[PDB]
Amino acid sequence: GAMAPSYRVKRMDIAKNDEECVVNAANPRGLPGDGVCKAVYKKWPESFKNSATPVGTAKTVMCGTYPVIHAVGPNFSNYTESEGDRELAAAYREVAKEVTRLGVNSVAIPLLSTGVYSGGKDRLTQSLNHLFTAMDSTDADVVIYCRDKEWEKKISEAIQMRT
Ligand SMILES: [Cl-]
Ligand SMILES: [Cl-]
Ligand SMILES: [Cl-]
Fold this sequence. Notes:
The chain starts with 6 loop residues before the first strand and ends with a helix. The strands form two sheets. It has a three-stranded parallel sheet, covered by helices on one side. Strands 2-4-3 form a three-stranded mixed sheet, with helices on both faces. Helices cover 34% and strands 20% of the residues. β3 and β4 form a beta hairpin. The chain is built from four helices and six strands. It has one domain. The protein is globular and about 40 Å long. It is an alpha/beta fold. It binds chloride ion (3 copies). The site of one chloride ion (CL) has 3 residues, from loops. It is a peripheral membrane protein. This is Non-structural protein 3.
C-alpha cells in the first residue's frame, strides 16, 4: 500500500499516467472504441485480448507486466437513471476489488460514464462519488485523469473538501 494513501487529479491523457496500473473506460465488447478507450487501445493494445466483460464489471488483462483494468460503466442512453446509477456504482466496486488483488500502490482512473456514455448529462459528481465510495477502503494512491479545465477545478475542490 501507499505510505499515506491520497487522491489527486490531473488534466492530461491517462495513456501517459505515472501510476502502477490503469483503469480503462471500456465498452462491453473489448473494442477499441473512442475517447479514453481508444487512447488505451493505442498505448496497450495487447491488453484487449479477451477483455470483453458485462456492464457493471471489471476485467484485468496484463500488457507485459502492466495491468489494464477494463471497467464497463453503463451507457445512460440505454439504462434508466435508477439502473444506470446501480451499474455505475457496481463497476467502481469491481475496480476496487481488482486494484486490491493486484497489490499495486497506485492506480490511474478516469470518471466512468461521463463522456459518450453520459446520455448528454453532466455526471461529474455522480461518477466521482461512486469512485470515492469504492476506493475509500483501498490503500492505493488514486490519480483521477480528466481533459476539461472546469472539471479539473471541480474534482480538485471535491477532493480538498474531505480535507
Ligand atoms: Cl496530454
Ligand atoms: Cl464514457
Ligand atoms: Cl473531462
